């Protein structure tokens, strides 16, 4: 079901096996050290492996999570095959520890044998204005749609500004549960007959 869908939940406790398989996964995790974080062990323990058989993972990282994100990506069964950077500019296309930071990194991982994707349509550099702090640039969605048009996608640790057609968005600041895909709706009621997602 094409229009946006979402589940407010503690991603730690949701049984994601109800969601089906996805052509693309994207996560922008709250890595450990305002909002709720996950420890490194919790990050590692996420059930990312059930979300795909063949497809791509997009994993935003920063600081020391550049290394820890590579660990989770490998632990969850992916090989890192690309690394996207977003060059942060102002509205006049000028660039906003040891150096000042002008970019953010998004690791790109592959699982299995993805077929029918339009690899090589975009390049690995995004140039876009910092619209709102902590927000990823909307350009990533277009890149992912050109790469895998029409397919099912899931975002972990998203926020209401993140919901998109063809995407299911998970995060704890979303507005209740809004599911439209009949296969998903069926499995959710079965798994959660009283609509409560508990530990």
């Amino acid at each position: 079901l094409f229009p946006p869908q979402w589940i407010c939940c503690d991603i730690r406790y949701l049984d994601v096996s109800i969601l089906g398989k996805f052509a693309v996964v994207m996560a922008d995790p709250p890595w450990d050290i305002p909002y709720g974080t996950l420890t490194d062990d919790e990050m590692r323990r996420l059930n990312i492996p059930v979300l795909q058989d063949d497809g791509f993972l997009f994993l935003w990282v920063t600081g020391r999570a550049m290394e820890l994100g590579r660990e989770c990506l490998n632990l969850w069964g992916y090989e890192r095959v690309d690394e996207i950077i977003w060059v942060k500019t102002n509205q006049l296309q000028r660039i906003i520890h040891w150096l000042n930071h002008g970019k953010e990194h998004c690791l790109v991982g592959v699982k299995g044998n993805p077929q029918g994707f339009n690899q090589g349509l975009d390049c690995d550099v995004i140039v876009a204005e910092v619209r709102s702090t902590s927000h990823k640039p909307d350009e990533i969605y277009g890149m992912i749609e050109r790469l895998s048009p029409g397919t099912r996608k899931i975002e972990l640790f998203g926020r209401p500004h993140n919901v998109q057609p063809n995407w299911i968005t998970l995060g704890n600041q979303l507005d209740g549960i809004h599911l439209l895909d009949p296969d998903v709706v069926a499995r959710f009621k079965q798994r959660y007959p009283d609509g409560i997602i508990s530990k």
Partner: protein, 243 residues
């Protein structure tokens, strides 16, 4: 505007549209403090790296990767990982490792940890195509996207941005942008600086360059050591000479 859609529409890479893309006193201090350029032709595989003394404050490592020769001895990450870099690095010292844009972003990190560093910066060399918007890209089989940048990883053991933007060099040109030296020298990390796999074309005051394609050598270990004997042992490279 969406510059990614634009690049799909026109072939102009998004980085083409970035604009503007007393620190002169620091530079002049760097130049006064710089040792004479020193350089040595050596096949680094067959060379006991321990013959390079004393222990270096900065190491810039630029191994010639196969991926640099798209349409053209290559070192593999297997070979690079076997370099005994921790034998020549000072207990507090810095490394700058050109990792390319593929598997090197991972194996380069294995290298840094193997030699005892932790990564504190990731410097990306972003290549514009303003002069050849049409020219496409033979993609790596595993690549998902067109690769238009290279990473230089900075590691530590014991004013500037992390971006370098220049036009993509001519095919077969393997030179890295000289801006990396400015970034490095503006850190004021000490004066013993080693460039492994440098070339005649990268020799530079304040650096010892070692690599197989140098046509001449002037390296002498004792002469080299003499530049850092007391009172000059601990200079940052950004302070006045001691009278």
């Amino acid at each position: 505007n969406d510059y990614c859609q634009h690049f799909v529409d026109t072939g102009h890479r998004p980085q083409n549209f970035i604009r503007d893309v007393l620190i002169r006193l620091k530079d002049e201090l760097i130049a006064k403090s710089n040792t004479p350029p020193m350089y040595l032709q050596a096949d680094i595989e067959a060379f006991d790296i321990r013959e390079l003394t004393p222990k270096f404050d900065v190491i810039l490592l630029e191994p010639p990767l196969e991926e640099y020769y798209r349409e053209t001895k290559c070192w593999t990450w297997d070979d690079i990982m076997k370099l005994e870099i921790d034998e020549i690095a000072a207990p507090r010292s810095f490394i700058f490792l050109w990792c390319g844009s593929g598997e090197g972003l991972d194996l380069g990190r294995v290298c840094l940890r193997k030699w005892g560093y932790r990564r504190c910066e990731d410097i990306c060399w972003i290549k514009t195509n303003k002069n050849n918007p049409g020219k496409t890209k033979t993609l790596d089989p595993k690549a998902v996207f067109q690769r238009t940048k290279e990473h230089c990883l900075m590691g530590i053991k014991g004013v500037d941005i992390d971006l370098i933007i220049t036009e993509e060099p001519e095919i077969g040109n393997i030179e890295k942008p000289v801006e990396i030296f400015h970034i490095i020298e503006h850190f004021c990390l000490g004066r013993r600086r080693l460039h492994l796999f440098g070339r005649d074309s990268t020799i530079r005051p304040g650096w010892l360059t070692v690599g197989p394609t140098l046509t001449n050598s002037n390296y002498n270990a004792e002469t080299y050591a003499s530049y850092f004997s007391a009172p000059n042992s601990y200079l940052t490279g950004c302070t006045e000479e001691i009278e």
